[PDB]
Amino acid sequence: VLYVGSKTKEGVVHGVATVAEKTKEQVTNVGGAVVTGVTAVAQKTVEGAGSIAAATGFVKK
Amino acid sequence: VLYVGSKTKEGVVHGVATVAEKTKEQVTNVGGAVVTGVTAVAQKTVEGAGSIAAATGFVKK
Amino acid sequence: VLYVGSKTKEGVVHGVATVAEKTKEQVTNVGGAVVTGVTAVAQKTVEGAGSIAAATGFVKK
Amino acid sequence: VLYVGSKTKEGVVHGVATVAEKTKEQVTNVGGAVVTGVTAVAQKTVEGAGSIAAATGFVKK
Amino acid sequence: VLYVGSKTKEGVVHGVATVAEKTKEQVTNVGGAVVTGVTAVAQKTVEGAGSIAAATGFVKK
Amino acid sequence: VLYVGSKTKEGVVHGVATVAEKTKEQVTNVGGAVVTGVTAVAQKTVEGAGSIAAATGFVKK
Amino acid sequence: VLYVGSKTKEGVVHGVATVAEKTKEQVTNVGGAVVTGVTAVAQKTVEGAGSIAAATGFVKK
Amino acid sequence: VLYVGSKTKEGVVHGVATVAEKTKEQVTNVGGAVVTGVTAVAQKTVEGAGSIAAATGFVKK
Amino acid sequence: VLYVGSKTKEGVVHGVATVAEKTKEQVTNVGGAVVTGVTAVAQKTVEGAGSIAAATGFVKK
Amino acid sequence: VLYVGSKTKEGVVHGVATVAEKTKEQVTNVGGAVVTGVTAVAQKTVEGAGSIAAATGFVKK
């Protein structure tokens, strides 16, 4: 027997509940990067890379 | 027997609850990077890299 | 028998509850990096790197 | 028998509850790095590195 | 028998509760690094490094 | 001016989040009363009565 | 001016978050009363009565 | 001016977070009353009565 | 001026966090009353009565 | 001026955090009254009575 893999869970998200009450919100940006409100995200990668909520102002070369 | 893997959990998030009440919010940015409000995120990587909530103002080369 | 792995948990987050009440919030940035409000995040990496809430003002080369 | 691994837990976070009440908050930044409000995060790394809440003003080379 | 590993716990955090009440908070930064409010974080590393709440003003080379 | 009532809140419930993970549940009853799993309920009464989660085995007269 | 009432809050519940993880639960009853799992409930009463989680085995008259 | 009431709070519950992890639970009853797991409940009463988590085995008359 | 009431708080509960980890629990009852696990409850009463976590075995008349 | 009441707090509970870890618990009862685990409860009463965690075996008349 070579039962290498079974009943496995790799990068999983599964019981999640959120509530958000706002009166105002004023996300505002100039030449930059905003990431906001990220919830319930999963992933798996082989021989690569991973990123979920990445911001970068810029990359000047 | 070579039961190498079983009933495994690698990068998992599974019982989560949040509440947010705001009257105002004024995320504001100039030439930079904002990451805000990140919740319930999982992942797995082989032979790569990982990042979840990364900010970077810029990369000038 | 070579029961190498079983019932394992590597990078897991699973019972979590948060409440946030604000009247104002004024995240503000100029040329920099803000990471704010990071909750319930898990991951696993082989032969790479890991980062969860990384900020960097900039990287001038 | 070579029961090398079993019922293991490596980088786990699992019973957590927080409450935050604010009237104002004024995170403010200029050319720097802010990390704020980091809760309930776990991870595992092989042959790499780890970081959870890292800030860096900048890296001038 | 070679029961090398079992019922192990390496880098775990699991019963935690916090409450924070503030009227104002004025995190403020110029060219530096702020890390603030870090709670309930665990991790494991093989052949690498570890860091949880690291701040660095800058690294000029 | 007789500004008797304004901007009032009488019996209100408004920011609420719950998560429940079970493998089994075996509510079982014989001749009795079970109330179970009651969440997020509000009401107002004038010149009457109120009840939310009331159980009564029986009323033999 | 007779500003009798304003910006009032009478019987209110408003920022609440819960998580429950169970493997088994075996609520069981014979001729009695069970109330279980009551969360986030509010109410107001004039000239009456109030009750939220009341159990009574029986009332034999 | 007769500013009798203003910005009042009478019977309020508002920032609350709980986590519960169980493997088994065996609530069991015979002819009696069980109240269990009561959280985040508020109310107001005029000229009446109040009760939140009341148990009574029975009332034989 | 007759500023009789203002910015008042009467029966309030507002910053609260709890964590409970159990392996078993065996609440068991015969002809009696159990109240268990009561958290974060507030109320106000005029010209009546109040009770929060009351148990009574029985009332034989 | 008749500034009779202002910025008052009557029966309030507001910054509270608890953690409980148990392996077993065996609350058990016969014909009696158990109250157990009562936390974070407030109330106000006019011209009535108050009780929070009252137990009574029985009242035979």
From Swiss-Prot, chains A, B, C, D, E, F, G, H, I, J:
Tissue expression remark: Highly expressed in presynaptic terminals in the central nervous system. Expressed principally in brain.
Residues included from the entire protein: 37 to 97 of 140
Post-translational modifications: Phosphorylated, predominantly on serine residues. Phosphorylation by CK1 appears to occur on residues distinct from the residue phosphorylated by other kinases.
Region: 4 X 11 AA tandem repeats of [EGS]-K-T-K-[EQ]-[GQ]-V-X(4), residue numbers: 1-31
Positions bearing Phosphoserine: 51
UniProt-reported outcome of changing residue 14 to A: Impairs copper-binding
Effect noted on mutating residue 21 to K: Increases oligomerization
Intracellular or extracellular location(s): Cytoplasm; Membrane; Nucleus; Synapse
Subunit structure: Soluble monomer. Homotetramer. A dynamic intracellular population of tetramers and monomers coexists normally and the tetramer plays an essential role in maintaining homeostasis. Interacts with UCHL1. Interacts with phospholipase D and histones. Interacts (via N-terminus) with synphilin-1/SNCAIP; this interaction promotes formation of SNCA inclusions in the cytoplasm. Interacts with CALM1. Interacts with STXBP1; this interaction controls SNCA self-replicating aggregation. Interacts with SNARE components VAMP2 and SNAP25; these interactions allows SNARE complex assembly and integrity.
Record family assignment: Belongs to the synuclein family.
Protein name: Alpha-synuclein
Sequence repeat positions: 6-20, 21-31
UniProt lineage: Eukaryota, Metazoa, Chordata, Craniata, Vertebrata
Binding-site positions, Cu cation: 14
Disease affiliated with this protein: Genetic alterations of SNCA resulting in aberrant polymerization into fibrils, are associated with several neurodegenerative diseases (synucleinopathies). SNCA fibrillar aggregates represent the major non A-beta component of Alzheimer disease amyloid plaque, and a major component of Lewy body inclusions. They are also found within Lewy body (LB)-like intraneuronal inclusions, glial inclusions and axonal spheroids in neurodegeneration with brain iron accumulation type 1.
